[PDB]
């Protein structure tokens, strides 16, 4: 069979902060995406280039599973051509995105009484991210006319902020776990394929 390790990214006990989003590379395997659709009860499962019924009969060079955690009302930003703190300074998606965005409510696991301060995001950036860029620098952000010289203070800000997830929030402010599947189709051989392409070999 040599099936693909989705349970290693969708059921990981711990997920990454959005600014340091994690990325697993799925390759040399077969994948049943209709199983993944009905695998759980996902709050969000939106596919842009394609659809999951059609995905079971396609072949791609590699697949990438980017994973992280954000506020519910930030999941709208995990889409092509969006703007916001998250889509511009943490996780950017190409306009020509062929892939699926999947997200589910993770309140029981990631919010804590008084706040979970281990989840973070980038709050300040001179420029927008390029699509699929990752930025983990912690250089002080100059918000004024006076340079900062690496010293934090007035108009000189540490660029990361804690989410502080609490259960007493409304859903919009609750932590959601997100997995972005992106299907690259380079000129190299397809390492990942769907199951419907075994009929051509029997």
């Amino acid at each position, epitope marked *: 069979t040599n099936l693909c390790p989705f349970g290693e990214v969708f059921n990981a006990t711990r997920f990454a902060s959005v600014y340091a989003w994690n990325r697993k590379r799925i390759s040399n395997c077969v994948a049943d995406y209709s199983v993944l659709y009905n695998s759980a009860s996902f709050s969000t499962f939106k596919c842009y280039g394609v659809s999951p019924t059609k995905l079971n009969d396609l072949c791609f060079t590699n697949v990438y599973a980017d994973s992280f955690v954000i506020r519910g009302d930030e999941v709208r930003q995990i889409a092509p051509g969006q703007t916001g703190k998250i889509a511009d300074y943490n996780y950017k998606l190409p306009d020509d995105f062929t892939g699926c965005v999947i997200a589910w409510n993770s309140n*029981n*696991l990631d919010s*804590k*009484v*008084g*706040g979970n*301060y281990n989840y973070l995001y980038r709050l300040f950036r001179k420029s927008n991210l390029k699509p699929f860029e990752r930025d983990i620098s912690t250089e002080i952000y100059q918000a004024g006319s006076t340079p900062c010289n690496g010293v934090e203070g007035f108009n000189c800000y540490f660029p990361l902020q804690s989410y502080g997830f609490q*259960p*007493t929030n409304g859903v919009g402010y609750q932590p959601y776990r997100v997995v972005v599947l992106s299907f690259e189709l380079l000129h190299a051989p397809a390492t990942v394929c769907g199951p419907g392409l075994e009929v051509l070999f029997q």
Partner: antibody, heavy 123, light 109 residues
Framework: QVQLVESGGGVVQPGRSLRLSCAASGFTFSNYAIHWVRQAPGKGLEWVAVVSYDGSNKYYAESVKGRFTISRDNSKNTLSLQMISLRPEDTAVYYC????????????????WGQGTMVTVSS | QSVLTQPRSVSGSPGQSVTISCTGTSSDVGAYNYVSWYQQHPGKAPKLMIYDVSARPSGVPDRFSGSKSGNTASLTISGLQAEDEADYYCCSYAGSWVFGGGTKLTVLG
């Protein structure tokens, strides 16, 4: 065997001070929030106070604010409740309560309980 | 302050079912679904029987079931057995953890 053990109960006179302790074993104490919940003899439950996993965020119930102080040592895996100006209305069994690592229950529910310790405020 | 309102007593014949109500405000039981139900036998600590309104912790029989509607949660015990005779307490975690007055469930013998 995840286990919480309370200690430091006894009889105090109205107006004096006592300090209860709750020691933890079997799980990752430093990872979850833990609460004090009390029950006066023959009556119902009353939530008293909670401390976050981080040890700085602490919340109490109005009936108790100003008099009880909650704290936790995440290196010794203990927590303490310092009570002062004790009234007779505080006479009760004090349980400490949290959740365990295996449990899928969040920390805002009282899944794991101690055996309690009795505090009797009587002149 | 506030206390969620449970019936003082409930009686149920063995093998049959019973339902303990637990009525609160829109700022308590209605605010969030953080409703829980605890069982307490004489002289021992409470045990969590229901959370997230309808959820059963590991090792709690499916005879215990939890529901909510408006400002009122309801614990339901089917297939009543003598061991179920006990005090039951609901709890709502909205602004603070608020308990109910308790309900003494007698299994009629």
């Amino acid at each position: 065997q995840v286990q919480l053990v309370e200690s430091g109960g006894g009889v105090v006179q109205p107006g004096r001070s006592l300090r209860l302790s709750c020691a933890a074993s079997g799980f990752t104490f430093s990872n979850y929030a833990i609460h004090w919940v009390r029950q006066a003899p023959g009556k119902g439950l009353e939530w008293v106070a909670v401390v976050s996993y981080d040890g700085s965020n602490k919340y109490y119930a109005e009936s108790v604010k100003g008099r009880f102080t909650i704290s936790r040592d995440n290196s010794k895996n203990t927590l303490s409740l310092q009570m002062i100006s004790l009234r007779p209305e505080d006479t009760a069994v004090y349980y400490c309560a949290s959740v365990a690592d295996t449990a899928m229950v969040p920390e805002w529910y009282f899944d794991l309980w101690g055996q309690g310790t009795m505090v009797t405020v009587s002149s | 302050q506030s206390v969620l309102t449970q019936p003082r007593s409930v009686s149920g014949s063995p093998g049959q079912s019973v339902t303990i109500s637990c009525t609160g405000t829109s700022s308590d039981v209605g605010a969030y679904n953080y409703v829980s139900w605890y069982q307490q036998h004489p002289g021992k600590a409470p045990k969590l029987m229901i959370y997230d309104v309808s959820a059963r912790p590991s090792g709690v029989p499916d005879r215990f079931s939890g529901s909510k509607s408006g400002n009122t949660a309801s614990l339901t015990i089917s297939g009543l057995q003598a061991e179920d005779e006990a005090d039951y307490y609901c709890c709502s975690y909205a602004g603070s953890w608020v308990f109910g007055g308790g309900t003494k469930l007698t299994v009629l013998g």
